Amino acid sequence: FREDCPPDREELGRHSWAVLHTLAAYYPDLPTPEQQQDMAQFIHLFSKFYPSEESAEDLRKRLARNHPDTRTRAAFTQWLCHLHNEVNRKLGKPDFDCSKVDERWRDGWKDGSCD
Amino acid sequence: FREDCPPDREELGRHSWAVLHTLAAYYPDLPTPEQQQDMAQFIHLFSKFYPSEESAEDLRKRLARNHPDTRTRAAFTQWLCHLHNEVNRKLGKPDFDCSKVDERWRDGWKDGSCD
Numbered sequence: 131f132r133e134d135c136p137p138d139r140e141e142l143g144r145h146s147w148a149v150l151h152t153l154a155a156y157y158p159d160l161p162t163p164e165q166q167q168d169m170a171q172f173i174h175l176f177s178k179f180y181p182s183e184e185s186a187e188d189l190r191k192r193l194a195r196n197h198p199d200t201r202t203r204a205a206f207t208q209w210l211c212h213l214h215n216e217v218n219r220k221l222g223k224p225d226f227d228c229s230k231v232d233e234r235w236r237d238g239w240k241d242g243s244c245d
Numbered sequence: 246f247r248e249d250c251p252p253d254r255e256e257l258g259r260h261s262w263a264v265l266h267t268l269a270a271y272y273p274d275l276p277t278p279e280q281q282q283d284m285a286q287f288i289h290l291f292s293k294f295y296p297s298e299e300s301a302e303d304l305r306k307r308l309a310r311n312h313p314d315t316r317t318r319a320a321f322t323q324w325l326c327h328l329h330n331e332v333n334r335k336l337g338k339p340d341f342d343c344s345k346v347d348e349r350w351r352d353g354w355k356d357g358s359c360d
């Protein structure tokens with residue numbers, strides 16, 4: 131019944147997706163070369179530190195075969211959603227509909243339910 | 246009443262501290278030069294992308310005056326806790342007792358309440 135405990139696999143995963151999908155969602159539509167390199171390095175280093183040894187190792191391999199597209203906010207947000215669906219599929223979870231990433235992570239549901 | 250909405254300032258902040266304090270907590274006790282450089286760069290780039298413009302700008306300045314100590318897991322976990330207390334103080338929040346960072350973010354309360 132305590133909420134101030136060390137996040138387990140699932141809780142840390144939920145926090146980490148929230149972070150990553152939020153950062154993606156406010157990444158520029160026209161990022162500078164520096165911002166593109168910087169964001170590719172961010173996700174690279176994040177993968178180096180992600181503390182679940184199983185989780186992080188699959189993620190490093192998954193990224194070796196699938197480099198972050200940081201060209202634009204659109205490409206990077208979709209890329210990240212496609213990355214997340216790969217882990218969802220791994221875990222038996224359904225795909226998240228990536229045409230929804232903007233509503234979910236930046237703008238809110240179009241029907242108004244986050245108001 | 247929806248939990249799948251875009252995190253506001255406070256929710257993203259809570260996710261982001263969870264991430265950062267969890268990553269810190271599993272950082273090596275004897276990190277290699279590479280791991281030290283990599284973690285200093287991670288926090289640097291994180292500060293570049295943190296999407297609250299006010300929040301992120303204070304954080305970049307706060308880091309210019311206070312560079313991440315990534316020498317060891319102990320120094321980095323304490324450093325991060327001291328960084329977090331600076332934001333808590335800014336916001337009128339009490340200091341978190343940094344001798345507790347291990348219980349809170351890795352091992353669980355010593356009294357057994359995360360079991």
Ligand SMILES: Cc1cc2nc3c(=O)[nH]c(=O)nc-3n(C[C@H](O)[C@H](O)[C@H](O)COP(=O)(O)OP(=O)(O)OC[C@H]3O[C@@H](n4cnc5c(N)ncnc54)[C@H](O)[C@@H]3O)c2cc1C
Pocket residue numbers: 139140141142143144145146147148151180184185186188189210211212213214215217218221223225226228231234249
């Ligand atoms: C980088 C990373 C790698 C991980 N690797 C593993 C692993 O190898 N093995 C393992 O057991 N766990 C892994 N996890 C943890 C795992 O993915 C989940 O976070 C955890 O299992 C809790 O799942 P959940 O059902 O609450 O939803 P989560 O998968 O945590 O998703 C959180 C929320 O994000 C939204 N969402 C879901 N999919 C997408 C999408 N594709 N795009 C945009 N938004 C989405 C939904 O609103 C959902 O409620 C990993 C987590 C991360 C961040």
Ligand SMILES: Cc1cc2nc3c(=O)[nH]c(=O)nc-3n(C[C@H](O)[C@H](O)[C@H](O)COP(=O)(O)OP(=O)(O)OC[C@H]3O[C@@H](n4cnc5c(N)ncnc54)[C@H](O)[C@@H]3O)c2cc1C
Pocket residue numbers: 134254255256257258259260261262263266295299300301303304325326327328329330332333336338340341343346349
């Ligand atoms: C890097 C960063 C910079 C931010 N800058 C601003 C800003 O400039 N202005 C603004 O309004 N908001 C800022 N925020 C958001 C803000 O700090 C809080 O996250 C948010 O206000 C919600 O606060 P909270 O009371 O739920 O606890 P949080 O501050 O979100 O803390 C979450 C939990 O962490 C634990 N904790 C608290 N302090 C520490 C500590 N020092 N060390 C270890 N664990 C701790 C406690 O268990 C607490 O419940 C920032 C967030 C981050 C991650």
